[PDB]
Symmetry: C6
């Protein structure tokens, strides 16, 4: 009766997570700029829809839906079609040039409307942050969503996220790195923690290509 | 004559060897570590093994993880915590926030210790001043009850401060550090008994793994 | 058309190769660097080449260097910016402070007038709570995108291998990020350029050495 | 200058005869480095070997735990308290610096103590509050060990960056992690007015207390 | 050399005019930053002194802490008689030593016009406030047509260029003097980090301070 | 008329300083705890008296005069006698159970009362720290005193003094270090800066012995 996992179908990931993302829980995906956070959270939804007909909700706070859709064309994915078919909903919480309760109600309404099984959320007292994140995680779990939530960090081998508390209130933590060494960049993915279940340890190299994320062996 | 500090066995593989007999009885042991280092696991094993091996009841006090998730996650190791709660040998005390007062918490814990006649307690998990003073009080109250207690704390660097506020180790009788060090793209888990007041213990870091059977520590 | 984002050529030696075709069109690219790394040079060369090679007018927004000093220094690279200004192909908008809070909303409208007046396709913008910086930069980026400009915006940083920019937020609201470095190794300096991020498209990774010459930036073959 | 023997194995050699009489010695270390043990041993040996009574001042650890913990070294502190040779001054919680000082003075006069151990914002305030404490202990004639906390092995002497500059004598206890192993060392950094061995010397804590190897 | 966009005046400081490809950009300010005792005041004085001796270009020296008497006294280390130059009206030392920047600027202007000065040396809360006033001072000297050396302090050999993290960004030109300690020995170097509108040699170049002032040794 | 120097007679130092301390100015002597700052400043005055019959004034802010005397006995220096003879004056500015201009009054008075040619002063707004040190330096200069003033620092290879401003208002700067080499300590002396005059550069090893500071220029 240990926790079950949901397949990401992201090449390499379901192997190192031994089955995918823990179902009904949130996974924090943290990374410096341009590490593949949005791509991971899109590929999660896109594969849910295409492979399993599991509808998805994508929550954006800054990037517009138009740009998310445009950028996904880089990978040969037609997100506008999936939205039009009612398989995907891009929920725009991005500011026009905060009430967590209101946001949570909108996410819940969208999940019910689209019968969504997968959610991606992308992306000043740390006591405040800790409390609010806790509440968001709790509410998504109550709803039954399996969720990817991305977060920013500014150092490759420093704090997991910005406020030093995000990981401690997350059930699952994944870290994307983009390490510069000898003038070259190397992308890696690490599953740091999955509460109540197993996973491979340490950094695994990956690339972003025309196909999305590809994760490779040691 | 040399009168030794009594210890109670954790029965966590390898730990009773490193600690020269287990955790000092009637005192609190701080168990600190970065995220996913096995803090909750250690604190659950402590109670579980007490009940299963020694019929010593336990109280688990949780501040963030819900009891249902604690129970769910324990299934990963083949442990049936709901059954122990049903038999009244384990009490999970839910101090979660529903999505300040310490005295109330203490009486609640005291009540539970009395009701379930628990010998073992696990507690999971602004200024330097208040945290030092508040933690000092909690240690003192638990000691007056006679509980042997594991209390977990967070830290954010493997080789930095022992806990978050830089004072927690100084008001703790006993300090254990769980590390998860990243080197050359690989992770290595270690456990270190840093301090046990009034008694002996092995020194330095000892590697461990987490598997289907929980924590397994290797000397070395 | 339902195609991945297209690019406009900078014609800066080597850069269009590293970026696989140039800067993403209709978007802003952050160009960050310590002092004297070539930020202003990169911003100007982007506009200059647009005008000379493609007859695409440019607007240069300066916040500290006077237009006269911008024009004077650009002669170092064989470029006659006064001539381009006279012909109405280049407009320098002087937002530099009085030698004798800042309304970014108002400035944006004036930038838009200039873009409209000069029919500009390329824009360069040459350089305290971080939440305020994030929101203001976000709004500027959005407004330029709405206008349809392809924009270079420079920012400052103080360490070669530290934060991308001053407030730790600038790169996260930028679609594109380029880092110019000037690394001191064994008493010598080595200039490098890195495209760190281009949302929605491919680019070469890591650092590429370059020099500044009498013809501007020259990024070496790799 | 006249020194008083600690009789802590190896320490009197390192200090070239012991701790200068009538003066204060800071003993700083990270957690579990042996600060309390050093403090206790200093008083214990003074009583047992030289019939020099002692006062132990504790701010957090209770008297009963101090006594209990000392029992494992085979040291019967309760017996010494009963004989009036040791007084443990409980300043534990459940300012005034001056109120405490007057109580320290009173116990010293009462028990005829020659040895004192004191077991553990603005630098400005701390520096002259500590200077005040040190100055007065001197006037009384006590020879004092004052422990302080630090959070890094190689880094500031003590928490507030001034403690060492008002102390006559400074001792640092370290617990350094090399690879995955811990090694304890003691260093006399400073002894005003006299010579001493320099640098770090390894020690162990065993059933008989601190054992240092020069 | 001839094919460069910015006219320069020669410091006549041995080796500097080579590294700067002709000297300091005329009518602009050059920041000279360095830790303590790196040669900042010496460079500033040598600039004015050589201007007077070589080209009969009068100079103004603005001091904010060192007294004129001590600046004169210390310059005798190099066999320079600054009192004689002050007597002859070729040098003016403006004593601003113990903010009203406007009043200061007017004093500097009056002295420049009074002494017909061509060369100026200035020696030496929020970053934003420092940035804007520095920007203003630079702009005013530029309007006047002065060629200015302005020294600033820094506290690390390989850290920030100056104290407030903004000074280099509002300067047209930036020079860093270092005094690097390595293996118990000090070695002095000079670097021209930036000269807007022109080329210059890059990196660090060795120099010494002797009885003849600064001697820089360029290479390449 | 380059600035002249007065001999310290401290073994090796007059070589490193090419003649001694600049006359009529202050020299800052900075170092971590127990580096020999008080000892250097005492040896400065003791040698003034013994070698040149130049009286000295010692200004103490922490240590009592009695402790200063006692601590110098291990070097064979009889400061009690020097005080009894009126050749040395120890000015006590310790804590009462900050008017700086009061201090100069007291120092000035002692200087002319004792015919003194040498002075030692031993020993968080960097704003005001800079200004007040600047003022003290200037006042001592107008008196004509040649002064050693000690100051604290907390790292062997970091800031010269505590507030990062002290060296910039000092005419002269000397740094004493006490460095770990393996588990042993090595003491070194550095003359970092003497305005308007020459000096040897870098660190020179020294020891503290029964005859005080002993430096080797090698
Ligand atoms: N077709 C492609 N081939 C290769 N790499 C690509 C392609 N399309 C996009 N990328 C890469 O994907 C990166 C963007 O990844 P994202 O998922 O947008 O990163 P991010 O971590 O979300 O960054 P933010 O949100 O801007 S902080 C770009 O910087 C490119 O390096
Ligand atoms: N069956 C299993 N086999 C191997 N590893 C497991 C298994 N079940 C759980 N784990 C590991 O146990 C870790 C969780 O340990 P916890 O005790 O929950 O950590 P924690 O230190 O309490 O972390 P927090 O509370 O989230 S900061 C997971 O990240 C897994 O790596
Ligand atoms: N003809 C040239 N040949 C070689 N290098 C040159 C030439 N002209 C200018 N430079 C260099 O260009 C640098 C200035 O480039 P900029 O683009 O002004 O840098 P920046 O990053 O904008 O610096 P700021 O704004 O002052 S922080 C100078 O410091 C010189 O090193
Ligand atoms: N009988 C014993 N045998 C071996 N080691 C012992 C024994 N008794 C105590 N210790 C050791 O001594 C340490 C405690 O020393 P203390 O002097 O209490 O440390 P401390 O530096 O005062 O730490 P605090 O006050 O908790 S920060 C324990 O952590 C053990 O490692
Ligand atoms: N006879 C001696 N032989 C060798 N070393 C000695 C002798 N007497 C004193 N010392 C050393 O001199 C040091 C004291 O030097 P001080 O000049 O008092 O140091 P300090 O830098 O003033 O330190 P403060 O003021 O306490 S921060 C002692 O720590 C001893 O190491
Ligand atoms: N005749 C000389 N021979 C050799 N070196 C000398 C001579 N005269 C002075 N110096 C050196 O020049 C240094 C003084 O240089 P300055 O120009 O005064 O430094 P600075 O950078 O202005 O320092 P400040 O203002 O005190 S932070 C001294 O520390 C000596 O090392
Ligand atoms: Cl890639
Ligand atoms: Cl493991
Ligand atoms: Cl170059
Ligand atoms: Cl030990
Ligand atoms: Cl030199
Ligand atoms: Cl020595
Ligand atoms: Mg993104
Ligand atoms: Mg846990
Ligand atoms: Mg620029
Ligand atoms: Mg203790
Ligand atoms: Mg100077
Ligand atoms: Mg001293």
């Amino acid at each position: 009766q240990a926790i079950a996992k949901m397949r990401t179908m992201i090449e390499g990931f379901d192997d190192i997570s031994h089955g995918g993302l823990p179902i009904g829980r949130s996974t924090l995906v943290s990374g410096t700029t341009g590490t593949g956070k949005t791509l991971f959270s899109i590929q999660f939804l896109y594969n849910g829809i295409i492979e399993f007909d599991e509808p998805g909700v994508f929550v954006t706070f800054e990037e517009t839906p138009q740009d998310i859709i445009k950028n996904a064309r880089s990978f040969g994915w037609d997100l506008a079609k999936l939205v039009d078919e009612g398989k995907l909903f891009i929920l725009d919480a991005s500011p026009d040039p905060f009430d967590l309760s209101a946001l949570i109600e909108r996410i819940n309404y969208a999940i019910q409307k689209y019968r969504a099984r997968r959610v991606s959320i992308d992306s000043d007292a740390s006591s405040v942050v800790r409390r609010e994140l806790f509440r968001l995680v709790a509410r998504l779990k109550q709803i039954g969503a399996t969720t990817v939530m991305t977060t920013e960090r500014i150092e490759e081998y420093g704090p997991i996220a910005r406020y030093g508390v995000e990981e401690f209130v997350s059930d699952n933590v994944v870290i994307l790195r983009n390490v510069l060494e000898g003038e070259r960049r190397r992308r890696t993915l690490e599953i740091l923690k999955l509460r109540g279940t197993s996973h491979m340890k340490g950094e695994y190299p990956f690339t972003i290509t025309d196909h999305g994320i590809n994760i490779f062996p040691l």
